[PDB]
Ligand binder design. Structure first.
Ligand SMILES: CCC(=O)SCCNC(=O)CCNC(=O)[C@H](O)C(C)(C)COP(=O)(O)OP(=O)(O)OC[C@H]1O[C@@H](n2cnc3c(N)ncnc32)[C@H](O)[C@@H]1OP(=O)(O)O
Ligand SMILES: CCC(=O)SCCNC(=O)CCNC(=O)[C@H](O)C(C)(C)COP(=O)(O)OP(=O)(O)OC[C@H]1O[C@@H](n2cnc3c(N)ncnc32)[C@H](O)[C@@H]1OP(=O)(O)O
Ligand SMILES: CCC(=O)SCCNC(=O)CCNC(=O)[C@H](O)C(C)(C)COP(=O)(O)OP(=O)(O)OC[C@H]1O[C@@H](n2cnc3c(N)ncnc32)[C@H](O)[C@@H]1OP(=O)(O)O
Ligand SMILES: CCC(=O)SCCNC(=O)CCNC(=O)[C@H](O)C(C)(C)COP(=O)(O)OP(=O)(O)OC[C@H]1O[C@@H](n2cnc3c(N)ncnc32)[C@H](O)[C@@H]1OP(=O)(O)O
Ligand SMILES: CCC(=O)SCCNC(=O)CCNC(=O)[C@H](O)C(C)(C)COP(=O)(O)OP(=O)(O)OC[C@H]1O[C@@H](n2cnc3c(N)ncnc32)[C@H](O)[C@@H]1OP(=O)(O)O
Ligand SMILES: O=C([O-])C(=O)[O-]
Ligand SMILES: O=C([O-])C(=O)[O-]
Ligand SMILES: O=C([O-])C(=O)[O-]
Ligand SMILES: O=C([O-])C(=O)[O-]
Ligand SMILES: O=C([O-])C(=O)[O-]
Ligand SMILES: [Mg+2]
Ligand SMILES: [Mg+2]
Ligand SMILES: [Mg+2]
Ligand SMILES: [Mg+2]
Ligand SMILES: [Mg+2]
Lengths: 347, 347, 345, 344, 344
C-alpha cells in the first residue's frame, strides 16, 4: 500500500489534485441504460430528472458489435445534456477487453469534466486499480480535467472478494463497491442462475417433530456474508457499498425485499435496470418513516448526544444517538428532493 | 506483530510479568453499572455476589457532566469492597477523549491490584492496543501492581472489524472482544436504532407461488457474520468472545434469544444492563441440561476419547468426544461456583 | 508465499513436476471407510464402483489400538484393487501424532502411484502444508512416484479458518478444503455435539406480535459464514470446497438439506460416512434437472454469451450466461459418468 | 500501517492537526546539554545563538539521582529563554523507564508550545511510536498545544534497524532518525567500546606479492545507507548521532563528512568544540556548490544534455546540483559568512 | 509467523518443550570434519577437547559414494565419545537431496540426545524451517529426546538473504546463521571462485592527482551487517562460515576478525591450523578487555557519565564494555592464559 503523503499526490503532471473526502449526495438509485439504443437515449434528460445517479453501460448486456456504438452514444448523450444534481457514471468494458483503452480515453477526452465516476467490472486485485488510477491521471492531465474522476469497483469475482481490503485502499479515487451477484455466483460456482434474491434450495430443516409431524424449512439469505463483508471493508476505508442488479424485473416484491436487506446492512443504494425499478430503489434506500420518527425522538431525548434515556422500555445512550443521527441525516438530505417525504419525516 | 521472545516481556521496569495463559473462571454475565449513581453504588456489594463479572462504566451512557463523578464513584466502591470470586472490569472512556488519561491512571493508582480487566471502547486498530499496553505497563510499574491488567477490546467500529486479527495479536494482555452492536450499527451505517436482536425488515422472501398470495418472509440474523468472525479471530488467538448489550431491557424473550444465538456460535458470555438481565445471561451461558447429559453419554461411550460409536442413530467419534468435553468442562467450572447448577449437572 | 517462479518446482530431486491445473473429474461424493474392518474391506471394490471418490480413514473414528491395522488395511485393499475412474484419497493422522510419519511413508512406498489425494486433518497454518509438501516430495523421490500426490486440507480449527488464505496459497499440491463441523465446533467452542445440520436454539425471534400472539422463531444456518468464506478462499486460489461429514446417518432428510446448502453456496461435494449417504451426495451435488433446463434456455437465448435477453420476466446477460454454463458444463460432465443424468438432462 | 485518511487525523479531540510536511529549517547541528547542571543551564541562551538545534538530554549520561533535576532544569531554562530561530528538542527517558511518563507530561504541560521535537531513545518498533503519538495527542489536547510535537527516533537497537520501515511510517509526527552508534554496537554485540568512527581491526588484506597492504573499511556504511533510504522514502530526515571521542576532531570531521555525503542532514554535538565541526561539515563545500552552479547554468531549464570538463550532465545531475545549491541557499540566509563564499 | 502462544509449543506429542532462551556457551570455533575418513575419526576425541563446537559434515565436500559412510561414521564416533562441554553439531544434506530424510532420522534415532544443533544447508525460506521443525518434533517424540535439537541455518542463497527475517522467526529451534560465501557467491553470480576474503578487482579508484591509488573494499560488508542485524533482532547468533584458503592464514585471520568486529560469534575451521585462528580472533583482544573493565569500574551502576583517557563514557559505553567483559569471563573460565591475560 502507498505511503499516505504519496497517496494524495497526482499521478501525472497536470492531473487534478486527488480528493480527500467523497462528495456527499443522494445515491439511492444507480440507473443503468444502454447508450446505443436511440429511443432510450432520447428520453435520457427525462430519466435523469428522476434518478440520483445515471450510469451508462458499455460492458455486459451490451452486444459485442454494439460496443463502439454504446461508447459513442454515451458521449453523444452526455454532451447534449445538463444533468444538474444527477450524478453521471459509466461502466466501461473489462481491463482485458479490446474496448477498454478507447472507452476510457475517448470518454475522458470528450466529457471528462462531466464524468463523476467510472465503474470498472471484474476487478480482481489492487493492480487493477493501480492501472486505472495511473491511466486516468495521464488522460486527465492531457485533457485538462478540473477534478478527479472517481473509481467504483464492481465486486463480482472470488478474487475480488478475497482481495477486498487491498482493492479498497489502492487509490484516493476509490468511491465504493457494487455487489454483482450474477458474475460473483458464476465465479464462485454458486449453483444458481438467479441474480440476487432468495433461493428455495437454501434453508435450514427443523428437527423431527413431536409425532411424525411435517418439518419446517426456513429459507436463508445467500448474500449475508458477502454484503456484510463488503460493507465492513468499504466503510472502514471511507467508501460506500451498493447492492448491484436484481435480475427478476417483474418480481417487484422480491426486488424490494432484496433492496431492503442491503439497506439494513448498510448499503447506500442499488441499481435499477428498468423504469419500474427506479421508484423501488428510491423508496427502499430512503429511511422508513417510522424509523425516522423514532430516531428524531432519540435525538430530542438526548440533545447533547451524551448520557442515558429510556424510550418505550428500550435503553438509549450516546451510541443509539449516533444511530439515530445516521438515519436522520440521510432523511434530511432526501427530504429536500421529495416534498412527500419531508411531510412524512417532518424534516 | 512483536517477536515471540519479546511478546511476553514487561513493557516497563517493575511492571508485572505478562501472562502466558488467561485466568480460568466463569464469565457468563458481565454486569454493567453507572458508578456515579449513589443508589446503585450502595447495592454494588450485594449485586457483585450474583454476577460472574462486574464492570463499571465510564463511557457511553454516562453524561459528560458526570464523567469525573463516575470515575471517582467506581474507585470508591472498589476500595471499600472485597469482590471475592467476582471478576472486576471497568470500561474507560475512548482513547481520543479528555477523560481517558485520568480514567486509567487514577484507577490503577487506587485499585490496580483489584482490577482484572480494562475494557477499551471504540477500538480501531493494533495501535490502540499498543498505546494501552505501554501506558498500563508504566502505571503498573509506578504503583507496583502485582498482576497484569488485561485488555478487553470493545468491537464496535468498521475499522475494528477489518483489523480484528491485528488487534487480537497486539498484546499478551488481550483477554477478548465484546460485540457492541449499537456503535457498530452507527459505524457501518446499518439502518436501525435497535441494539441487537432481530429486525422485521431483514428477511428472505419466498418465491412467488402462482395462484397463491402468501409469500413467506423468513427473518434473518443481522449479526451472523459479525459474531462468527469475532469468535474465529478471538479463539484462534486464545481469547474469548462476548455478546455485548441487548438494548430492549423489557423484552426478555428477545434478549434470551439473542443471548442464546451468541452462546451457540461460541460466545463465552453477555453483558447485563439491569438486574433483570442477570439471570438471563447466567441461564443462557450455562450449558443446558440435556446438552450436558448427551455429552456425558458421549464421554462414556469412548472413555479414552478415541474410536467410533453410534448413539440414537448418530455417529460419535474423537471429535464429538471433544465437543462433549467442551460442554462438560464448562458445566463443571460453573457448578463449582453455582450451587443450583451443581446439582443440576453433577458435582 | 513462495515466488511464482519457484512455486512450481519440485521440492526434491526425482520428485514429479508439480501440477499446474487440478485434474478434472467428478468429486460429488467422498466415501469414507475404516480400513481395519475386514467385512468392509472385502466390500470396498464393489463400493468403489458407486462413488466418485473413495477415502480411507486413519484418523478420528479409528481407535488407537487399530491405527496400525487401519494403515495396513488401507494399503492392502489398495494394492489388490484397480479403482478405475474412482479417485483414491486417504486421511492420515494429525501432524502431531505418533502415527503420521509412518502413515505417509508406508502408503507412498506401497501405493504412492495409486494415491490421488492425501487429506491432512486439524490444519492450523501454512507451516503445516510446508511440512507435508516437503515430506511428500522426498518420499516421491525415494519411490519414483510419477505424479504429485495432492494435499486436501481439513478445515476444522479456528486457527485454520483465520489462516485460510495462507494455507490455500502454500503449495501447488493444494486440492481444496473440507469443512469438518465436529472438530471446528469443538475448536470454536460452538455449544453443540451435533455434526452439521441446524440447531433449534439458533434463530431470530420476531417482534411482539399483537394481542400477544405467539412470536415466530426463524431458525438460522450455523454454517453460512464458514462455508461462504471457505468457498471464496478456495475458488480464488483455484481450489475446491467440500462439505465434510453429516453425523446423523439416519436423518437422510436433514442430510440432503445440509448437502444442498453446501452445493448452492459453491461446494463441489460432500462426504458419505455410510452407504445410504452415497446416493444422497451424488443426487445433491449434481445440478437439479430444472436448474439445467432453465440454464439451457439461457445459453440458447444468446449462444455467444454476449448481449441481453428477457426470459420469464428475468433479465439475462453475459454473466447469467456464465452462471448457466457452470451448471450445464457440470451437468454434461456427470452425465457421461452417471447414466440416469444423460437422458434426464 | 494506518489508512491514509486516518493517518492525518488528530488522535485526540482538541489536539492540533497533524502536519503534512516537515518544517523547513537548518538542522546541521543538534547540540546536546545536561539540564541539571546549573552552569550549563545559565549559559544556554548564549549557546543557542550558535546552534541550529538545541536538545536537552534526560536519558543516558544523566545519573539516576539527577533525572528529576534534569527534567526541572530543562523546563526552567526553556520557560525563561526565547530561542528564536533555534529549534528546541528534548531527549526523554526510555519507554520502559520510571521517568518517561513524567518527562513527557510535565514538559508538554509547561513548555509544549515551545517544544518542536521529542527524541525517543531505544526505539524497537512501530508500537513504540503508536504509544508516544497517542500519549502526545492527549497531552496536547489537555494543554491546548497549538502545533504538533514531532517524534525523532533514536536508532540504536538491532530490532529498531530491522523494523526501520515500520517505525518510519507509524505516525505523521515522525521527523527522522539519529544513529546511536554506542547503544547500537552494544545491541548488535559489535566488539568495540568506541562511539562512531573507524576501528583498526576492520579491513581487507591484499593478496600476497613483501608486505601486504591492509585497507580499513567503514563499519557504518550499511547502517547509514539503510537509515537514509528508509528515512528519505518516508519524507523523513536522517542524522548521525554522537561522536564519542570529543578530542579527536579530525576523526569527528571525517565521520560527520561520511554521513553528510551519504545523505544525513546533520549530527549531534556533545561539547562546544564539536559545534563548528558539525556546522562546517553539514554545510555544502564551496567547490561542490560552485560546480553545481556550473551545472545549473549549462542546464537553464533542467532538461537535456551537456558536457563539462569531460563530464556529462543531464536532467538528473541538474537535480543533484539543485539539492546542493538549495541547501547552500537556505544556510546562506541563516549564515552571512557562507552567503558570499557561496555567492548566494 | 506463528502466534506467540503456539510458537513455544512442541509440534509433536512427546517432543520436548521448545527452548525460551539459547544455551550459553563459547562458540568461537565451529570445527568441520568428514566423518567417513577413518584416520580423522580416530582423532576426534582429541580434537573435541580443543574446540568450542564440533560439526560433522555430510553435505558439500563429501562425495556422493561416501554420503552413507559419512552418516554412519558420524553416528559411530558420536556413540563412542563423551564430548563434555564441547557442542555437537551436524550439517546434514540439503532438503531436496536423496540423503536428508535418513540423515536426520537415523542420527536422531541413534544419538539424538547428544546432538545439540543441526545445520541445514541451502536454506531458501521459512518453509524449509517449518519442515525441519515438524520433522524433528516427530522424531524427537518417537525416540524420547529430552531436549530440543536446535536449527542452524546456513545462509548461502540469494533467496535466503532476501527471506532472512522470515527464516529467523520461523521457529523456537532457531540457533543462528552461518555465512556460506562459496554457495552465496555462486547463487548471486558474484564473479569469483574464492571462498571469503578480499578480491583485488573490488576497489575504489582515487581521483587523478601521480599514479591513482586504489583502495580494496570488503565484498561481504552488506552481507555480514544484514545477517548480524536480523540474527540479533531475533535473539540469534551470526557466524562467519568457511575461509577456503587454508594456507593463507593471514587472510583468514583478517576475514575472521572483520566478522568478529561486526558482531559474529564465531567462525568455521576446516583444518587443524584454522582452529587456533578462530579461537584467537573470536576471543576479545586484551586491550579491549582491560579498557572495558575501566569503563565498568568508572560507572559501577552503569548510570551517568565519565571521562577516561580523553574518551567520554556513559550508560551506552558501559553496556558495550559489559558485552566485551562478559564474553571474556566465559572464555577465561576454560582458558587460564586468557584468564591471566585478561586478568580474570
Ligand atoms: C446481471 C449482470 C449485469 O451486468 S446487469 C447490468 C446490465 N444490464 C442493463 O443495463 C440492462 C438494462 N435494461 C435494458 O436493456 C432493457 O431494460 C431491456 C432488458 C433490453 C428490456 O428492453 P424492453 O423490452 O424495451 O423493455 P420494456 O418493453 O419493458 O421497456 C419499456 C420502456 O422502458 C424503456 N426502458 C427499458 N429499460 C430502460 C432503461 N434501462 N433505461 C431507460 N429506459 C428503459 C424502454 O425503451 C421502453 O421505452 P418506451 O416506452 O418504448 O419509450
Ligand atoms: C448501547 C451502548 C452501550 O453503551 S450499553 C452499556 C452502557 N449502559 C449501561 O451500563 C446502562 C446501565 N443501566 C442503567 O443505567 C439503568 O438500568 C437504566 C438504563 C438507567 C434504567 O434504570 P431503571 O429504569 O431504574 O432500571 P430498572 O427500573 O430496571 O431498575 C431496577 C432496580 O435496579 C437498579 N438498577 C438499575 N440498573 C442497575 C444496574 N445496571 N446495576 C445495578 N442496579 C441497577 C435500579 O436502581 C432499581 O433499583 P430499585 O428497584 O429502585 O431498588
Ligand atoms: C465426525 C468427525 C469425523 O471424523 S467423521 C469421518 C470418520 N468417520 C468415518 O469414516 C465413519 C465410517 N463409517 C462407519 O464406521 C460406519 O458406517 C458406521 C458409522 C459405524 C455405521 O455402521 P453400520 O451401522 O453397520 O452401517 P450400515 O448399517 O449402514 O451398514 C450397511 C452395510 O454397509 C456397510 N458399511 C457401513 N459403513 C460403511 C462404509 N463406510 N463403507 C462401506 N461400507 C460400509 C456395513 O458393514 C453393512 O454391510 P453389509 O450389508 O453387511 O455387507
Ligand atoms: C554515547 C551515547 C550517548 O548517549 S551520547 C549523548 C548523551 N551525552 C551527552 O549529552 C554528553 C554531554 N556532554 C557533557 O556532559 C560534557 O561535555 C562532558 C562529557 C561531561 C565533558 O565535560 P568537559 O570535560 O567539562 O567537556 P569540555 O572540556 O568540552 O567542556 C568545556 C566547557 O564546556 C562546557 N560544556 C561542556 N559540554 C557542554 C554542553 N553540552 N553544553 C554546553 N556547555 C558544555 C563545560 O561546562 C566546560 O566548562 P567547565 O569547566 O565544565 O565549566
Ligand atoms: C567451501 C564450502 C564448504 O562447504 S566448506 C565446508 C566443507 N568442508 C570441509 O569440511 C572440509 C574439511 N577438510 C578436509 O577434509 C581436509 O582438511 C582437506 C581440505 C581435504 C585437506 O586434507 P589434508 O590435506 O589430508 O589435511 P592436512 O594434510 O592439512 O591435515 C593434517 C592432519 O590434519 C588432519 N585433518 C585435516 N583436516 C582435518 C579436519 N577437518 N578435521 C580433523 N583433522 C583434519 C589430517 O588428517 C592430518 O592428520 P594426520 O597427520 O594424518 O593424523
Ligand atoms: O455485472 C454485474 O453486476 C453482475 O455480474 O451481477
Ligand atoms: O458500546 C456498546 O456496547 C455498543 O455500542 O453497543
Ligand atoms: O473430522 C471431521 O470431519 C470433523 O471433525 O467434522
Ligand atoms: O545514545 C546514543 O546516541 C548512543 O547510544 O550512541
Ligand atoms: O557451505 C558453505 O559454507 C559455502 O557454500 O560457503
Ligand atoms: Mg457482472
Ligand atoms: Mg459503544
Ligand atoms: Mg475432525
Ligand atoms: Mg543511546
Ligand atoms: Mg555451501
Amino acid at each position: 500500500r502507498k505511503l499516505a503523503h504519496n497517496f494524495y499526490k497526482p499521478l501525472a503532471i497536470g492531473a487534478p489534485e486527488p480528493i480527500r473526502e467523497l462528495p456527499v449526495r443522494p445515491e439511492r438509485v444507480v440507473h443503468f441504460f444502454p447508450p446505443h439504443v436511440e429511443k432510450i437515449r432520447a428520453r435520457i434528460p427525462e430519466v435523469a430528472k428522476q434518478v440520483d445517479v445515471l450510469c451508462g453501460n458499455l460492458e455486459d448486456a451490451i452486444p459485442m458489435d454494439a460496443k463502439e456504438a454504446a461508447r459513442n452514444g454515451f458521449i453523444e448523450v452526455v454532451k447534449a445534456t445538463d444533468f444538474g444534481d444527477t450524478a453521471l457514471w459509466v461502466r466501461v468494458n473489462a481491463l482485458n477487453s479490446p474496448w477498454v483503452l478507447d472507452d476510457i480515453a475517448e470518454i475522458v477526452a470528450a466529457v471528462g469534466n462531466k464524468l463523476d465516476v467510472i465503474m470498472i467490472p471484474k476487478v480482481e486485485g489492487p493492480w487493477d486499480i493501480h492501472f486505472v488510477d495511473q491511466y486516468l491521471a495521464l488522460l486527465e492531465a492531457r485533457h485538462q480535467i478540473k477534478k478527479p474522476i472517481l473509481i467504483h469497483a464492481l465486486l463480482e469475482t472470488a478474487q475480488g472478494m478475497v482481495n477486498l481490503e487491498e482493492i479498497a485502499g489502492a487509490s484516493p479515487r476509490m468511491h465504493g463497491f457494487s455487489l454483482g451477484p450474477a458474475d460473483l455466483a458464476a465465479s464462485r460456482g454458486m449453483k444458481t442462475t438467479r441474480v440476487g434474491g432468495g433461493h428455495p434450495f437454501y434453508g435450514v430443516l427443523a428437527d423431527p417433530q413431536e409425532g411424525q409431524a411435517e418439518r419446517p424449512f426456513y429459507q436463508q439469505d445467500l448474500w449475508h456474508y458477502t454484503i456484510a463483508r463488503m460493507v465492513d471493508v468499504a466503510v472502514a476505508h471511507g467508501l460506500r457499498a451498493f447492492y448491484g442488479p436484481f435480475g427478476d424485473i417483474k418480481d417487484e416484491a422480491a426486488c424490494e425485499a432484496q433492496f431492503r436487506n442491503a439497506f439494513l446492512l448498510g448499503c447506500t443504494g442499488a441499481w435499477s435496470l428498468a423504469p419500474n425499478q427506479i421508484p423501488i430503489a428510491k423508496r427502499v434506500f430512503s429511511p422508513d418513516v417510522n424509523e425516522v420518527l423514532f430516531a428524531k425522538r432519540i435525538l430530542e431525548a438526548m440533545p447533547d448526544g451524551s448520557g442515558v434515556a429510556m424510550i418505550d422500555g428500550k435503553m438509549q445512550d450516546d451510541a443509539t444517538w449516533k444511530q439515530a443521527k445516521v438515519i436522520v441525516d440521510l432523511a434530511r438530505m432526501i427530504a429536500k428532493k421529495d416534498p412527500d417525504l419531508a411531510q412524512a419525516y417532518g424534516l
